[PDB]
């Protein structure tokens, strides 16, 4: 639709670039002179996507491709837009004519209004591919003082890996194993800032321990190929030599309800000699 984001999925802490596009901007609406367009954007909670205030680029593109880049201000004048930011939301008002009644229009023909801006994904975002109103924003664009536009929505997305650690023979769930997560580019996950996934050295990696249920949950990752690296085996088990590949997104296995952003790899462990005896 008319509201889009730059990536199909994100990791927590990533910059999300949003684009709002409105292609029907002309000088009359009904028989009424258009003297402004109002763009209102209601974002998710800032605990989910935190708007970067002041990040806007506002343009008008005419039918020939000519671009006018607008600048911020309250004056009713060509080349301007007014901004109000409150509560993680914003409203942009673009004056369209020098006066409100019949001329003194600033722009001619059929124009496209584009607003680009950014936000930052935070820890409250929900993972997966389902209907997620909490991850969704809505932008409306209306002439003059109308509020009838039903708006354009987009949902930011991320993924989750639920690791289950078992004994390869008995299939029992095993507590106390320690893993780190590696990406496809040689780096290790540091998720110590709960609002920001980071990738770096192994020494700086976050260590995850399998719980009483054998599980580790890592929530808030971009699609891609990851590798589960065992740092400590459960008590009595041999340390696994090699990592286990886990795909999140296209190509995923072990999905929950066919959702390739909710994956459930099982890692098998091998009892060490003393434990079979
Ligand atoms: Ca130009
Ligand atoms: Ca109305
Ligand atoms: Ca980051």
Numbering used by the authors: 185 to 286, 296 to 470
Reproduce the article's own wording on this structure.
The three GBS pilus types are coded by distinct genomic loci containing features typical of Gram-positive pilus islands (PIs). These islands, named PI-1, PI-2a and PI-2b, encode three structural pilus proteins, corresponding to the major pilus subunit (backbone protein, BP) that forms the pilus shaft and two ancillary proteins that appear to be located at the pilus tip (AP1) and at the base (AP2) as anchor protein of the pilus to the bacterial cell-wall. Prior to the discovery of pilus-structures in Gram-positive bacteria, the backbone protein of pilus 2b (BP-2b) was described as a GBS surface invasin (named surface protein of GBS 1, Spb1), due to its ability to promote invasion of epithelial cells. Here we report the structural and functional characterization of the backbone protein of pilus 2b (BP-2b).
We solved the X-ray structure of a fragment of the protein (lacking the N-terminal first 184 residues) encompassing domains D2 and D3. Pilus Island 2b (PI-2b) has been commonly found in the epidemiologically relevant GBS serotype III-ST-17 lineage. Using the three-dimensional information we generated the single structurally well-defined domains as recombinant proteins and compared their protective immunity with the full length protein in a well-established mouse model.
